[PDB]
Amino acid sequence: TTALVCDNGSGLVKAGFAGDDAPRAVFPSIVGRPRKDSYVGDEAQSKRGILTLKYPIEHGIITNWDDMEKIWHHTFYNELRVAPEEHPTLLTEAPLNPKANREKMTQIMFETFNVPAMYVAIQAVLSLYASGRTTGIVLDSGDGVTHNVPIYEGYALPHAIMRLDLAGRDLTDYLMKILTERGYSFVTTAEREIVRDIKEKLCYVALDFENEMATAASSSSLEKSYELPDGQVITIGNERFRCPETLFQPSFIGMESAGIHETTYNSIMKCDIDIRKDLYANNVMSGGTTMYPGIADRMQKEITALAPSTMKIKIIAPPERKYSVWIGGSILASLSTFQQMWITKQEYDEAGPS
Amino acid sequence: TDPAFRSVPKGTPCFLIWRIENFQPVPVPKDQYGNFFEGDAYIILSQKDNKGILEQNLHFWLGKNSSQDEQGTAALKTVELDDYLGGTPVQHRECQNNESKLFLSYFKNKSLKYLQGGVASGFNHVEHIVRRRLLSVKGKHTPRMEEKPEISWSQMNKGDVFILDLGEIIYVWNGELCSRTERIKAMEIARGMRDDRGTGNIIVVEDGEETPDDMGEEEFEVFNEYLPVADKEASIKSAEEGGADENFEKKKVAQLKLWKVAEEDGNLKITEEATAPLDKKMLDSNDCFIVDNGEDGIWVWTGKKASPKERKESMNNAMAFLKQRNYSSQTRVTKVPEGGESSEFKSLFKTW
Ligand SMILES: Nc1ncnc2c1ncn2[C@@H]1O[C@H](COP(=O)(O)OP(=O)(O)OP(=O)(O)O)[C@@H](O)[C@H]1O
Ligand SMILES: [Ca+2]
Ligand SMILES: [Ca+2]
Ligand SMILES: [Ca+2]
Ligand SMILES: [Ca+2]
Ligand SMILES: [Ca+2]
Structure with missing residues (x-):
C-alpha cells in the first residue's frame, strides 16, 4: 500500500503520494459558497463572482472544520482521485498546534473518510x-x-x-497598495490573484535597500513589464523590492514586530x-x-x-x-517505520482521539 | 523498531555502519567499513566504554551526490536510532570532504575510501507531463467521444466536432458540416473537463475561420503549433470519408458493458451485470464494478463499503482485459472511487 501526504497550508494545499519527489496536487486552500453547494481550490477562484470565498486555515491553524472537510474531500476525490479508505494518510500541522486541534483532524480523518491509518507531523x-x-x-x-x-x-x-x-x-496586499498609489487599479479579490502573480514573477530582495532605492530613483534600469489578462502592460519599479522588504522591515505594512x-x-x-x-x-x-x-x-x-x-x-x-514540508513527509511516509508511529482506525475506535 | 537496528547492543561497546538503500538502512559488511559510495548516505554508530561510561556517537554521513530521499532517510533514521538507545547518543552530521575528526578517527587504520556511484534513489520522479490529446465528438442522437491515436489533421474530418485537449487550454473545433447535437455535446464534454480540473479557458473554433483576426493572435499560435493550418487541406478528411454518425453511436453503445465484482460467500464472482443504457443506481457501494468501454477506456468503480479482495481483483481483471485483447497503449484502466466520479465516467451512463 502507498500512503498519501497532504500538507495543509494556509494558502495552498500540497498533496500527493508517498514516494514521489513532488506533490501532484497544488491548489489554493479556498472554499467558495454561493450568494454544487461548495467550490474548492481553483474552480472556486474561477467562479469568484457567484460565491463568497473563505479560508479554512488561518495563520497555519485550521479554524473552519466544516469547510476544511470539503478541502480534504476535494483533495481525495477530485485532485488525487483515490479512495481514502485504501491509503494511509500523513498530514502536517503548524508549529505549536493545540492538542484539541490535532484530535479533531484525527476524528475527521477516521469517521468521515475512513482512512486505515494516519499520522500528524510538524511542518518545520x-x-x-x-x-x-x-x-x-x-x-x-x-x-x-x-x-x-x-x-x-x-x-x-x-x-x-x-x-x-x-x-x-x-x-500581496502590500503590493496591491503601492501599485495603486503608483496609479494602477488593484483592489478586488480577482485582482489579488493578478498581483500575487506579479509578486512571484518580478519581486526580489535587495541586498542594500537604500542603495537599490537610490538606483530606481535616478534611472529606469530596474523597471520591468507585466502583461495583465487584458493585454495592458504596466511598469513595476521600486515596488519589486519594496514588497519583500516588509519581511525585514515590518513597519512598511504597519507592524512593529521584528524582522525575519x-x-x-x-x-x-x-x-x-x-x-x-x-x-x-x-x-x-x-x-x-x-x-x-x-x-x-x-x-x-x-x-x-x-x-x-x-x-x-x-x-x-x-x-x-x-x-520542503511535503517532500519531508514523503520520505517519512515511505519509511517502513511509518507503520509503527501511525495510529490505526481500530486503535482510534477503541481508545479514542487521545 | 527497524529490524536493522534491533541487534544494536544497548550497553556494551560496538561500532556499526548502515547504508541507506531505498528508504531503508542496510547494514554494511564488517570488512567493507570505510568504503563509502559518493552517491549514498550512511549511518555510523560508535560506542566506546571510556572509563566505565558508554560514550555513544551517532553519525550520518552524506555523500556529495546522495539523493534527497537518502539524505532525509539518514536524518530520520538517525533520530529513530537515537531514541531507541535512550536518547543519550550524540548526533553528528558528516558531509563528504568535510567530516569531523571524530568521524575520521574511526577509519584511520581501516582506510576511508570515497567510491563513485551508488544505489538508485527511491523517489519516483513526478514529471508533471500534461496530457495532450485530440478528441472526436460524433453522433446524431447523443454524440460519443473518442480519443484519436494522434494530434493531426489526418485524424479529423469536416463533418464532426473535435476537442483539442491541452490541459489548461481547450479548443472545440466545429466542422462546417457538423451536426447541431455534436456542437452542444462537445461543449458539455469540454465544460466537464474544465470543471474536473478546476480551471481552463475553452476556445470555440469554426471550420475555415482559423484566422489570427477572428480567432486570436496568441490563440492561433497554440492552435497552429499543434495543428498547422497549411497541412489541413491535404490531410483533413471529408465529412463523407467520416463514417455514419448513427453507425458510430451504435458501435459505442454496443461496446459498453458493466461487470460486477462481488465477494458472495468468500468466493469472488465476476458476472455480467448489464449492458445497454447504464444507470447510476446499478453501482452499489457494497461491491466493485468494471465499466467496459473497450478500447476507449476501462473504468473500475470502487464502492466505499467494498471488500479488499473485491478491490484487488477488480483492478486485476480490468488490467487482464487490456493484455488479453492486446489493446493499444492509449487504452487505460482508471480506478474511480465512489464520490470521485469524473464527467468522462458519468458520460458512459445515460441516467445519473
Ligand atoms: N517565486 C515566488 N516568489 C515569492 N513568493 C512566492 C513565490 N512562489 C510562491 N510564493 C508565495 O508563497 C505563498 C504560498 O507558499 P506556501 O504553500 O509555502 O504557504 P502556505 O503553506 O499556504 O502558508 P503557511 O506557510 O502560512 O501555511 C503564496 O502566498 C505565494 O504568494
Ligand atoms: Ca505552510
Ligand atoms: Ca544513491
Ligand atoms: Ca540524542
Ligand atoms: Ca457528423
Ligand atoms: Ca461486497
Missing part, C-alpha cells in the same frame, strides 16, 4: 529532514504565517519558537548557548515567501551583523523549498 520538522538535517533552525514563511522553529536532534524546541503573522498574503532576521536571531538566543553555533550554521529556509531572489544573501548579511563575529552564519535555500 519535515523541512529540516528534507534538507538532510536533524539539528537547525527553520524559517517557514508561506501565505498566512511565518515561523522560526529551532530543532535539535529531530525535535523542535517549543520554548524558542517564534510566530510572525507576516507572510505572503500580507505581501531578528526573529531568527531572537529564536537562537532563546536556545542553550552550546547549540547556537550549530543553529547559526544551519539556517534552513522553507515556504514560498522565502522564494524571493536575494533573500538568502540578505538573511546572510543581516544575521551576520547581529551575531557574534566568531560565529559562522550559513543560510540554506533549497531550490524546491516551497515543497
